[PDB]
Amino acid sequence: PRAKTGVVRRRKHKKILKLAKGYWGLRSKSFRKARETLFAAGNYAYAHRKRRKRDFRRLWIVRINAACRQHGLNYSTFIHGLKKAGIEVDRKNLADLAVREPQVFAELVERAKAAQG
């Protein structure tokens, strides 16, 4: 018996092409330029998923700094103050307190420079 390609290949191709929808030239039109583009896209996303975790760290840290430097002191001092005070709190993430409810943050600052006074 002969088993010719038959359907198979077209289908495996459409699969890839479905994924490549939106890309520029034949990167979205060519059942292989597409596949090339897709490899990269995979790696970039993996790389970038890890990146995201850091991109935000940074926002935050800059968030915090501007805001507590606003009550006169380093992010670094602030953070050490906190550490020294004990405050699993914040999580650089949750100094959005820096923005909504400053009063909270303000107090946190005092606590921070408290354990540094």
């Binding site: 897709l38 405050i87 999580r91 949750l94």
Partner: protein, 101 residues
């Protein structure tokens, strides 16, 4: 009020009545309520009061519909002569409805 709960190794600002996902909890039934760790006050007329891991007795009560959900992503790794797709990760989620501070 307010409150900064800690769960799933992550912390969130939980409000009078809401939710998002937290990560599979052994709270086997949907029809249940766990209280999670408090961590900073809230500022309203009920307080404004933080503290060293807020182990101040106070809890946040949250009930929760849910099911270890999923989603999508697809984690493809690639080199040169080496490819690996063998990751559709979805990721167990846990939905919730926070009840009171």
């Amino acid at each position: 009020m307010f409150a900064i709960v800690k769960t799933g190794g992550k912390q969130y600002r939980v409000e009078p009545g809401l939710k998002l996902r937290v990560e599979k909890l052994d709270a086997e039934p949907g029809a249940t309520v766990e209280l999670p760790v408090l961590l900073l006050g809230g500022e309203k007329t009920v307080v404004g009061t933080p503290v060293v891991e807020g182990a101040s007795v106070v809890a946040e009560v949250l009930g929760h519909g849910r099911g270890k959900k999923i989603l999508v992503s697809k984690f493809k790794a690639k080199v040169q002569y080496r490819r690996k797709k063998g990751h559709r990760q979805p990721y167990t989620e846990l939905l919730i409805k926070e009840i009171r501070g």
